[PDB]
Amino acid sequence: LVESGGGLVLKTTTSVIDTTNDAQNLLTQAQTIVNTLKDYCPILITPSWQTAGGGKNSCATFGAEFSAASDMINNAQKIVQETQQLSANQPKNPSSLTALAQKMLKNAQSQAEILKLANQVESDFNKLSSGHLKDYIGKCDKNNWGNGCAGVEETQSLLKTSAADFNNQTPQINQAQNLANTLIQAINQAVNNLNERAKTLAGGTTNSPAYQATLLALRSVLGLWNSMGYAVICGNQKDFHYTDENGNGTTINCKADKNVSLSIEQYEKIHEAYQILSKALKQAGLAPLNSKGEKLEAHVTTSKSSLRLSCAASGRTFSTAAMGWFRQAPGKERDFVAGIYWTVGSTYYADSAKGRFTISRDNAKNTVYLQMDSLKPEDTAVYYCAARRRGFTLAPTRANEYDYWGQGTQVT
């Protein structure tokens, strides 16, 4: 028996994404996260919901939070578009002064549209953060998962303060409409007023309830993924590098179909969407709603680690018998890894090896293969391939039961 295979293949791929921080961009990322999460409902595994969700899907456990988060995002998209027209149809300031009745009627109607959706957001934010993630998503405390760390409590706080002062200003533009609904200079005050509340609603940040509402929508799915993303099952195998606000850098190692788990491609999209969203919100921030945006760079890093051991047999063929692998950690006994037996080629795996190790064999070539993935330093031993010409009833799994052995081959 002759052992072959080497080099422990390592790919680390880094996406460099250069995109702006305009709200229409960020909302698409935020939409990516929720929608792929809400529409495929993958099973999940100090947290409260961890005990209940384990085994069962996440839309039973977070179905309310998702449709609440989704609505914020959809409502945020609704928030973005109204201010897009509101920028062009600002009332200006010879008797064609009849498009000024509608440019007030439109500018004032749009503003009344802006506020109601802001209520649906915070209504849905309360629908979101008063569920299982009551006191996880809001605050921020080696590892930093499980807490949202989004700064939502800051945005919710500045949103209410921003909603309260546009309710102080309501009866005034609620009467600055009824005197403009007469269609058959006190309106020139409404132009400088609306074109001024419009100037503040679309161009403002700390004070604009249009801005602050959108920000809350964005940071929510940020925190929402921070609070439970690690728990989503995904998946050949990919490492998805994350980092936390503090500096602690984590990874996430990943049959993929609806209501079970995410495919790797599906996760790739969340991860990449998260990393952008994360990078845009903490550093340069969400741009004012009438802004074209500001260039920024996200990084997105993944990792694959793989090794193939082959084992060729100089005598006859063990395809109808038993071949297997043993691992000898430094200084110990030969511990069993995997075995494939009889010509039907049934397989058996060890405790440490299920899900990440795979044995196979090309009966035609009289070689057995061991594919190793999601490699950790806990492996890194000497690996032996071992064959058995003898018959057997139970699948052999200990060293004394195999008769032919290989030289041994190092792994790192």
Short mmCIF file of C-alpha atoms in Angstrom, two decimals:
data_model
loop_
_atom_site.label_atom_id
_atom_site.label_comp_id
_atom_site.label_asym_id
_atom_site.label_seq_id
_atom_site.Cartn_x
_atom_site.Cartn_y
_atom_site.Cartn_z
CA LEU A 1 0.00 0.00 0.00
CA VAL A 2 1.34 3.38 -1.25
CA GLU A 3 0.09 6.69 0.13
CA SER A 4 -0.16 9.79 -2.04
CA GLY A 5 -1.61 13.29 -1.87
CA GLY A 6 -0.11 16.56 -0.76
CA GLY A 7 -0.02 20.33 -0.46
CA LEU A 8 -3.21 20.99 1.60
CA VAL A 9 -4.99 23.27 -0.89
CA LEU A 10 -5.88 26.70 0.58
CA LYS A 11 -7.94 29.30 -1.24
CA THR A 12 -8.71 32.61 0.36
CA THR A 13 -10.73 34.90 -1.85
CA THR A 14 -11.25 38.55 -1.10
CA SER A 15 -13.87 40.64 -2.88
CA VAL A 16 -13.08 44.35 -2.98
CA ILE A 17 -16.35 46.19 -3.44
CA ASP A 18 -16.37 49.90 -4.22
CA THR A 19 -19.87 51.36 -3.87
CA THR A 20 -21.52 54.53 -2.60
CA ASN A 21 -23.55 55.08 0.58
CA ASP A 22 -26.69 56.39 -1.10
CA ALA A 23 -29.83 55.02 0.54
CA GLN A 24 -31.09 53.26 -2.59
CA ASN A 25 -27.86 51.21 -2.63
CA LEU A 26 -27.93 50.30 1.07
CA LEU A 27 -31.61 49.36 1.02
CA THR A 28 -30.96 46.82 -1.73
CA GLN A 29 -28.29 45.22 0.45
CA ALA A 30 -30.60 45.33 3.47
CA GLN A 31 -33.32 43.86 1.26
CA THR A 32 -30.97 41.07 0.21
CA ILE A 33 -30.38 40.04 3.84
CA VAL A 34 -34.01 39.86 4.96
CA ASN A 35 -35.57 38.59 1.76
CA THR A 36 -33.22 35.66 1.25
CA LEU A 37 -33.65 34.92 4.96
CA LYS A 38 -37.46 35.29 4.99
CA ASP A 39 -38.06 33.42 1.71
CA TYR A 40 -36.02 30.29 2.45
CA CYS A 41 -36.55 29.98 6.25
CA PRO A 42 -33.43 27.93 7.09
CA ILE A 43 -33.29 25.96 10.34
CA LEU A 44 -31.42 27.45 13.29
CA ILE A 45 -29.74 25.61 16.13
CA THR A 46 -27.41 33.16 27.11
CA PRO A 47 -29.85 33.25 24.13
CA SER A 48 -33.55 32.61 24.70
CA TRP A 49 -34.69 31.41 21.24
CA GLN A 50 -31.70 29.05 20.89
CA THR A 51 -33.40 26.33 22.96
CA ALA A 52 -36.73 26.57 21.13
CA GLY A 53 -35.48 26.98 17.57
CA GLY A 54 -33.04 24.06 17.58
CA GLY A 55 -34.24 21.58 14.98
CA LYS A 56 -37.15 23.75 13.80
CA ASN A 57 -36.95 26.57 11.26
CA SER A 58 -36.41 30.29 11.88
CA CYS A 59 -39.67 31.54 10.34
CA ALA A 60 -41.58 29.83 13.11
CA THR A 61 -39.20 31.49 15.58
CA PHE A 62 -38.75 34.85 13.84
CA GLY A 63 -41.54 35.04 11.26
CA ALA A 64 -42.87 38.20 12.91
CA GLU A 65 -39.47 39.87 13.16
CA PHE A 66 -38.80 39.16 9.48
CA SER A 67 -42.04 40.58 8.08
CA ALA A 68 -41.52 43.51 10.46
CA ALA A 69 -37.96 44.00 9.18
CA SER A 70 -39.07 43.47 5.57
CA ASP A 71 -41.81 46.05 5.94
CA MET A 72 -39.34 48.59 7.35
CA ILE A 73 -37.16 47.97 4.31
CA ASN A 74 -40.07 48.13 1.87
CA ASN A 75 -41.36 51.19 3.70
CA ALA A 76 -37.83 52.64 3.58
CA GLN A 77 -37.82 52.13 -0.20
CA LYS A 78 -41.15 53.96 -0.15
CA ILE A 79 -39.47 56.71 1.94
CA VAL A 80 -36.61 57.08 -0.55
CA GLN A 81 -38.71 57.45 -3.70
CA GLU A 82 -41.10 60.17 -2.46
CA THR A 83 -38.17 62.48 -1.61
CA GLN A 84 -36.82 61.78 -5.10
CA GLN A 85 -39.71 63.61 -6.74
CA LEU A 86 -40.01 66.03 -3.81
CA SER A 87 -36.60 67.44 -4.80
CA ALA A 88 -37.68 68.47 -8.29
CA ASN A 89 -41.21 69.66 -7.44
CA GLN A 90 -40.23 72.27 -4.90
CA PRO A 91 -42.66 75.20 -5.19
CA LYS A 92 -41.00 78.06 -7.01
CA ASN A 93 -41.30 81.67 -5.91
CA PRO A 94 -48.06 86.74 -16.34
CA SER A 95 -50.51 84.57 -14.42
CA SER A 96 -49.45 80.94 -15.10
CA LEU A 97 -49.13 80.49 -11.34
CA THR A 98 -51.33 77.40 -11.47
CA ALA A 99 -48.68 74.68 -11.38
CA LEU A 100 -47.86 76.28 -8.04
CA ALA A 101 -51.19 75.04 -6.64
CA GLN A 102 -50.24 71.42 -7.41
CA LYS A 103 -46.52 71.86 -6.62
CA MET A 104 -47.79 72.85 -3.20
CA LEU A 105 -50.48 70.16 -3.40
CA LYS A 106 -47.84 67.62 -4.47
CA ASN A 107 -45.09 68.83 -2.13
CA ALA A 108 -47.54 68.92 0.80
CA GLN A 109 -49.13 65.57 -0.11
CA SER A 110 -45.73 63.90 -0.45
CA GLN A 111 -44.68 65.20 2.97
CA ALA A 112 -47.84 63.77 4.52
CA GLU A 113 -46.94 60.50 2.78
CA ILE A 114 -43.42 60.59 4.23
CA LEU A 115 -44.61 60.75 7.87
CA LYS A 116 -47.17 57.90 7.82
CA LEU A 117 -44.61 55.41 6.53
CA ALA A 118 -42.22 56.52 9.28
CA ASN A 119 -44.92 55.42 11.70
CA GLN A 120 -45.24 52.04 9.99
CA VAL A 121 -41.46 51.63 10.33
CA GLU A 122 -41.29 52.32 14.06
CA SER A 123 -44.55 50.37 14.46
CA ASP A 124 -42.71 47.51 12.74
CA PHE A 125 -39.53 48.29 14.67
CA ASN A 126 -41.55 47.75 17.84
CA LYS A 127 -42.96 44.62 16.19
CA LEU A 128 -39.31 43.66 15.58
CA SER A 129 -37.44 44.50 18.81
CA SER A 130 -40.15 43.57 21.33
CA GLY A 131 -40.08 39.90 20.42
CA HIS A 132 -37.35 37.42 21.31
CA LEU A 133 -34.68 40.03 20.58
CA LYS A 134 -36.08 42.33 23.27
CA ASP A 135 -32.81 43.11 25.07
CA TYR A 136 -30.27 41.63 22.65
CA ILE A 137 -30.57 43.64 19.43
CA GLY A 138 -30.50 47.02 21.25
CA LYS A 139 -27.38 47.00 23.42
CA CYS A 140 -23.72 46.19 22.66
CA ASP A 141 -21.37 44.54 25.18
CA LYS A 142 -13.43 36.38 22.63
CA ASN A 143 -16.45 37.17 20.46
CA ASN A 144 -19.31 39.64 19.91
CA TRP A 145 -22.21 37.71 18.31
CA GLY A 146 -25.67 37.55 19.80
CA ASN A 147 -25.94 41.32 20.39
CA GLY A 148 -27.17 43.51 17.54
CA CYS A 149 -24.56 46.23 18.13
CA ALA A 150 -26.35 48.35 15.56
CA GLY A 151 -26.90 51.57 17.51
CA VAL A 152 -30.63 51.21 16.95
CA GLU A 153 -31.50 52.71 20.34
CA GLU A 154 -29.77 55.87 19.11
CA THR A 155 -31.75 55.97 15.89
CA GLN A 156 -35.09 55.08 17.48
CA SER A 157 -34.40 57.85 20.00
CA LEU A 158 -33.62 60.50 17.36
CA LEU A 159 -36.56 59.31 15.26
CA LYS A 160 -39.15 59.97 17.97
CA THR A 161 -37.60 63.40 18.62
CA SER A 162 -37.81 63.99 14.86
CA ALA A 163 -41.39 62.70 14.61
CA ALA A 164 -42.52 64.88 17.52
CA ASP A 165 -41.45 68.16 15.90
CA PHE A 166 -43.14 67.34 12.59
CA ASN A 167 -46.30 66.77 14.61
CA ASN A 168 -45.88 70.23 16.15
CA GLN A 169 -45.73 71.52 12.58
CA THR A 170 -48.74 69.48 11.37
CA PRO A 171 -51.79 71.80 11.75
CA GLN A 172 -49.82 74.50 9.93
CA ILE A 173 -49.20 72.46 6.77
CA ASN A 174 -52.58 70.81 7.43
CA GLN A 175 -54.01 74.28 6.92
CA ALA A 176 -51.35 75.23 4.35
CA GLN A 177 -53.15 72.69 2.14
CA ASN A 178 -56.84 73.59 2.60
CA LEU A 179 -56.23 77.19 1.51
CA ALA A 180 -54.33 75.82 -1.49
CA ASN A 181 -57.24 73.48 -2.33
CA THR A 182 -59.06 76.59 -3.58
CA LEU A 183 -58.85 76.09 -7.35
CA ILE A 184 -61.53 78.33 -8.94
CA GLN A 185 -49.19 86.27 -1.03
CA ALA A 186 -50.22 84.08 1.94
CA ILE A 187 -49.44 81.11 -0.32
CA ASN A 188 -46.01 82.61 -1.14
CA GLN A 189 -45.43 82.08 2.56
CA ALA A 190 -46.34 78.40 2.04
CA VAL A 191 -43.79 78.16 -0.79
CA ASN A 192 -40.94 79.47 1.38
CA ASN A 193 -42.37 77.26 4.15
CA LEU A 194 -42.83 74.05 2.17
CA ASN A 195 -39.71 74.63 0.13
CA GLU A 196 -38.08 75.01 3.59
CA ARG A 197 -39.65 72.04 5.36
CA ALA A 198 -39.00 70.15 2.10
CA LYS A 199 -35.41 71.40 2.17
CA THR A 200 -35.08 70.01 5.72
CA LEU A 201 -36.97 66.76 5.13
CA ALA A 202 -34.91 65.62 2.14
CA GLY A 203 -31.51 67.14 2.94
CA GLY A 204 -31.37 66.68 6.69
CA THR A 205 -29.87 64.06 8.97
CA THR A 206 -30.12 64.46 12.76
CA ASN A 207 -33.47 66.31 12.42
CA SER A 208 -35.07 64.67 9.31
CA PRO A 209 -37.60 61.90 10.10
CA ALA A 210 -37.10 60.71 6.54
CA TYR A 211 -33.39 60.13 7.12
CA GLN A 212 -33.75 58.80 10.67
CA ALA A 213 -36.52 56.42 9.64
CA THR A 214 -34.40 54.92 6.86
CA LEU A 215 -31.37 54.68 9.13
CA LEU A 216 -33.44 52.67 11.61
CA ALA A 217 -34.51 50.32 8.84
CA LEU A 218 -30.89 49.82 7.75
CA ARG A 219 -29.38 49.30 11.21
CA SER A 220 -32.18 46.92 12.13
CA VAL A 221 -31.25 44.23 9.61
CA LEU A 222 -27.68 44.97 10.61
CA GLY A 223 -28.41 44.16 14.24
CA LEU A 224 -30.89 41.45 13.28
CA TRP A 225 -28.15 39.56 11.45
CA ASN A 226 -25.66 40.31 14.22
CA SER A 227 -28.07 38.99 16.79
CA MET A 228 -28.65 35.62 15.15
CA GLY A 229 -26.83 35.21 11.82
CA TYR A 230 -24.23 32.79 13.18
CA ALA A 231 -27.19 30.51 14.04
CA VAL A 232 -28.37 30.08 10.45
CA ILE A 233 -27.41 26.74 8.87
CA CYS A 234 -25.76 26.91 5.45
CA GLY A 235 -24.42 24.37 2.95
CA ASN A 236 -19.00 22.28 -0.52
CA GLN A 237 -17.70 24.08 2.55
CA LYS A 238 -16.73 27.74 2.77
CA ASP A 239 -15.37 29.92 5.56
CA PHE A 240 -17.07 33.35 5.72
CA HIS A 241 -14.86 35.81 7.53
CA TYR A 242 -16.67 38.23 9.79
CA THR A 243 -15.43 40.91 12.15
CA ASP A 244 -17.05 42.64 15.11
CA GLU A 245 -17.22 46.36 15.94
CA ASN A 246 -14.74 45.78 18.79
CA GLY A 247 -12.01 44.16 16.67
CA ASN A 248 -12.68 40.49 17.34
CA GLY A 249 -12.64 38.69 13.99
CA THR A 250 -14.82 35.60 13.66
CA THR A 251 -15.51 33.16 10.84
CA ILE A 252 -18.57 31.04 9.98
CA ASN A 253 -18.08 27.61 8.53
CA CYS A 254 -20.83 26.49 6.13
CA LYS A 255 -28.96 19.06 1.75
CA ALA A 256 -29.43 22.72 0.86
CA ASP A 257 -33.05 23.48 -0.03
CA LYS A 258 -36.01 25.56 1.22
CA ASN A 259 -36.81 25.41 4.99
CA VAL A 260 -33.62 23.48 5.90
CA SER A 261 -30.53 25.60 5.23
CA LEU A 262 -29.00 28.18 2.88
CA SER A 263 -26.87 27.19 -0.02
CA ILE A 264 -23.32 28.53 0.07
CA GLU A 265 -24.16 30.88 -2.80
CA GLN A 266 -27.11 32.12 -0.76
CA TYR A 267 -24.89 32.83 2.23
CA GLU A 268 -22.23 34.43 -0.03
CA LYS A 269 -24.85 37.03 -0.98
CA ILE A 270 -25.88 37.73 2.65
CA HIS A 271 -22.28 37.92 3.77
CA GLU A 272 -21.29 40.25 0.95
CA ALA A 273 -24.49 42.29 1.57
CA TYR A 274 -23.82 42.38 5.27
CA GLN A 275 -20.18 43.44 4.88
CA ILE A 276 -21.15 46.33 2.60
CA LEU A 277 -24.05 47.39 4.81
CA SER A 278 -21.85 47.14 7.90
CA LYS A 279 -19.03 49.09 6.26
CA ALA A 280 -21.35 51.85 5.04
CA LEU A 281 -23.25 52.40 8.34
CA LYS A 282 -20.41 52.61 10.86
CA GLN A 283 -17.82 54.54 8.86
CA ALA A 284 -19.19 57.11 6.37
CA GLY A 285 -22.87 56.71 7.25
CA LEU A 286 -26.08 56.96 5.34
CA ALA A 287 -25.94 59.98 2.99
CA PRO A 288 -28.64 62.70 3.11
CA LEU A 289 -31.65 61.57 1.10
CA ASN A 290 -31.05 64.12 -1.69
CA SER A 291 -27.38 63.05 -1.90
CA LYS A 292 -25.82 61.21 -4.83
CA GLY A 293 -23.62 59.30 -2.38
CA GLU A 294 -20.02 58.90 -1.27
CA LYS A 295 -17.55 56.28 -2.51
CA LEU A 296 -16.47 53.62 0.01
CA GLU A 297 -14.78 50.21 -0.06
CA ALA A 298 -16.04 47.07 1.59
CA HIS A 299 -13.97 43.90 1.82
CA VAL A 300 -15.51 40.43 1.73
CA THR A 301 -13.29 37.46 2.62
CA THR A 302 -13.88 33.69 2.26
CA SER A 303 -11.77 30.56 2.74
CA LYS A 304 -11.56 26.95 1.54
CA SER A 305 -9.10 24.40 2.99
CA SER A 306 -8.85 20.95 1.39
CA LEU A 307 -6.64 17.87 1.19
CA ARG A 308 -6.97 14.59 -0.73
CA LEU A 309 -5.19 11.44 0.47
CA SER A 310 -5.02 8.65 -2.10
CA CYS A 311 -4.01 5.06 -1.46
CA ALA A 312 -3.10 2.54 -4.16
CA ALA A 313 -3.02 -1.24 -3.68
CA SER A 314 -0.27 -3.34 -5.30
CA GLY A 315 -2.08 -6.67 -4.69
CA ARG A 316 -5.48 -7.90 -6.02
CA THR A 317 -8.38 -5.50 -5.12
CA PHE A 318 -10.02 -4.76 -1.75
CA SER A 319 -13.13 -3.41 -3.48
CA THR A 320 -15.13 -6.41 -2.29
CA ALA A 321 -13.38 -6.26 1.14
CA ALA A 322 -12.40 -3.35 3.43
CA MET A 323 -10.23 -0.22 3.12
CA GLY A 324 -9.97 2.59 5.64
CA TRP A 325 -7.96 5.37 7.20
CA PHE A 326 -6.18 5.76 10.51
CA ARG A 327 -4.89 8.91 12.10
CA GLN A 328 -1.98 8.86 14.53
CA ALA A 329 -1.91 12.04 16.62
CA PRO A 330 1.59 12.79 17.95
CA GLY A 331 2.58 10.03 20.36
CA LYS A 332 -0.73 8.16 20.63
CA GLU A 333 -2.49 5.04 19.36
CA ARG A 334 -3.82 4.78 15.79
CA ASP A 335 -7.36 6.17 15.89
CA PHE A 336 -9.96 5.31 13.25
CA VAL A 337 -11.03 7.88 10.63
CA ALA A 338 -13.10 6.35 7.84
CA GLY A 339 -13.70 3.03 6.12
CA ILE A 340 -15.41 1.78 2.97
CA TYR A 341 -16.38 -1.84 2.79
CA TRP A 342 -17.46 -4.50 0.30
CA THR A 343 -18.17 -3.91 -3.34
CA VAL A 344 -21.38 -1.98 -2.54
CA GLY A 345 -18.90 0.42 -0.94
CA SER A 346 -20.69 1.30 2.30
CA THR A 347 -18.99 4.00 4.38
CA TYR A 348 -18.49 4.68 8.11
CA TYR A 349 -17.16 7.87 9.76
CA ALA A 350 -15.69 8.72 13.21
CA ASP A 351 -16.99 11.26 15.74
CA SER A 352 -14.54 14.03 14.69
CA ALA A 353 -15.03 13.30 10.98
CA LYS A 354 -18.72 13.33 10.15
CA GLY A 355 -19.85 16.08 7.84
CA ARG A 356 -16.28 17.19 7.07
CA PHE A 357 -14.52 13.94 6.04
CA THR A 358 -15.42 11.78 3.06
CA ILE A 359 -14.11 8.42 1.93
CA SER A 360 -14.52 7.13 -1.60
CA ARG A 361 -12.78 4.71 -3.92
CA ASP A 362 -12.39 4.11 -7.62
CA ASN A 363 -12.81 0.34 -7.81
CA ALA A 364 -11.42 0.52 -11.36
CA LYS A 365 -8.13 2.07 -10.17
CA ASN A 366 -7.85 0.11 -6.91
CA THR A 367 -7.30 3.34 -5.01
CA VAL A 368 -9.17 4.66 -2.01
CA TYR A 369 -9.52 8.40 -1.48
CA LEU A 370 -9.97 10.54 1.62
CA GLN A 371 -11.27 14.06 1.00
CA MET A 372 -10.73 16.39 3.95
CA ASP A 373 -12.42 19.74 4.29
CA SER A 374 -12.93 22.37 6.96
CA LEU A 375 -9.46 21.52 8.20
CA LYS A 376 -8.54 22.44 11.77
CA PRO A 377 -5.23 22.16 13.65
CA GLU A 378 -6.75 19.37 15.73
CA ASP A 379 -6.05 17.12 12.80
CA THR A 380 -2.50 17.56 11.69
CA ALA A 381 -1.34 14.00 12.38
CA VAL A 382 0.04 11.00 10.55
CA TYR A 383 -2.58 9.28 8.43
CA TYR A 384 -2.41 5.61 7.49
CA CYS A 385 -4.41 3.79 4.87
CA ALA A 386 -5.22 0.23 5.74
CA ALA A 387 -6.80 -2.67 3.88
CA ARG A 388 -8.29 -6.04 4.83
CA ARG A 389 -8.67 -8.96 2.43
CA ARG A 390 -10.51 -11.11 5.04
CA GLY A 391 -14.27 -11.42 5.24
CA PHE A 392 -16.32 -9.79 8.04
CA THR A 393 -19.91 -9.16 9.16
CA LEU A 394 -19.59 -6.00 11.23
CA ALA A 395 -17.68 -3.11 9.67
CA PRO A 396 -14.11 -3.17 11.04
CA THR A 397 -13.04 0.02 12.83
CA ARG A 398 -9.98 -0.73 15.01
CA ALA A 399 -6.34 -1.09 14.14
CA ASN A 400 -5.98 -4.73 15.21
CA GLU A 401 -8.65 -5.67 12.60
CA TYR A 402 -6.77 -4.41 9.47
CA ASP A 403 -3.93 -6.39 7.92
CA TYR A 404 -2.23 -4.16 5.32
CA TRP A 405 -0.85 -0.75 6.16
CA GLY A 406 0.81 2.16 4.39
CA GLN A 407 4.04 4.01 5.13
CA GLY A 408 2.20 6.88 6.73
CA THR A 409 2.01 10.38 5.36
CA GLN A 410 2.27 13.65 7.24
CA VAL A 411 -0.49 16.29 7.40
CA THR A 412 -0.35 19.89 8.67
#
